[PDB]
Amino acid sequence: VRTCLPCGPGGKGRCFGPSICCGDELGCFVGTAEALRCQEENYLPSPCQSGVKPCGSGGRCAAAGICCSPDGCHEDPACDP
Amino acid sequence: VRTCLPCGPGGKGRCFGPSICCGDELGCFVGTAEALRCQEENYLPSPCQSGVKPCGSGGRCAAAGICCSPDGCHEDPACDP
Numbered sequence A, B: 001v002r003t004c005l006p007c008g009p010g011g012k013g014r015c016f017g018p019s020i021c022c023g024d025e026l027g028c029f030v031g032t033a034e035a036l037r038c039q040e041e042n043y044l045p046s047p048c049q050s051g052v053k054p055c056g057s058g059g060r061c062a063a064a065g066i067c068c069s070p071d072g073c074h075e076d077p078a079c080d081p
């Protein structure tokens, strides 16, 4: 499954939702300017997925100790380095 | 009680948790550098609370359509402008 659009500082992050941009060395931007770019993903035909490890309920580790779904992010030890 | 520590671009944000910094016109920074000072609240012996309207489970509207508790943020219509 294709990875979602890249985003944020130095394009070092990937989109996890229409308005969620994360990276292991960035943390997560939720609804900030850095994640505006992620709104483009929804006008793209194919499905995308960011992150590798499944966590929480339908989410994916997006950053150090952080688990995100396209709807939000929460703290999750399972996502620690 | 008092609002939590200021954070983010030009002190416009407030802390909703150890690694959560949000502002109405900024969105939320979760685990990003912008939220680093937020972990300092932990050292303050007085209780704090940001946001004005409660939402979700122990959360508070932190930004346009976004609800955050000290350990996460999710899209929440109740928190819409």
Ligand SMILES: N[C@@H](Cc1ccccc1)C(=O)N[C@@H](Cc1ccc(O)cc1)C(=O)O
Residues within 6 Å of the ligand: A004, A005, A015, A016, A017, A018, A019, A037, A038, A039, A040, A041, A042, A043, A044, A045, A046, A047, A048, A049, A070
């Ligand atoms: N490419 C978009 C839309 C789409 C969804 C499902 C099937 C085909 C196309 C997409 O994959 N959206 C994601 C969620 C998402 C992730 C990042 C982002 O910046 C915006 C949306 C999905 O629904 O799987």
Ligand SMILES: N[C@@H](Cc1ccccc1)C(=O)N[C@@H](Cc1ccc(O)cc1)C(=O)O
Residues within 6 Å of the ligand: B004, B005, B015, B016, B017, B018, B019, B020, B037, B038, B039, B040, B041, B042, B043, B044, B045, B046, B047, B048, B049, B070
């Ligand atoms: N000052 C801290 C610790 C404390 C909690 C309760 C009573 C007395 C002291 C604090 O108020 N923590 C918050 C949660 C929080 C908010 C913002 C932040 O950056 C980090 C933690 C609380 O429990 O109300």
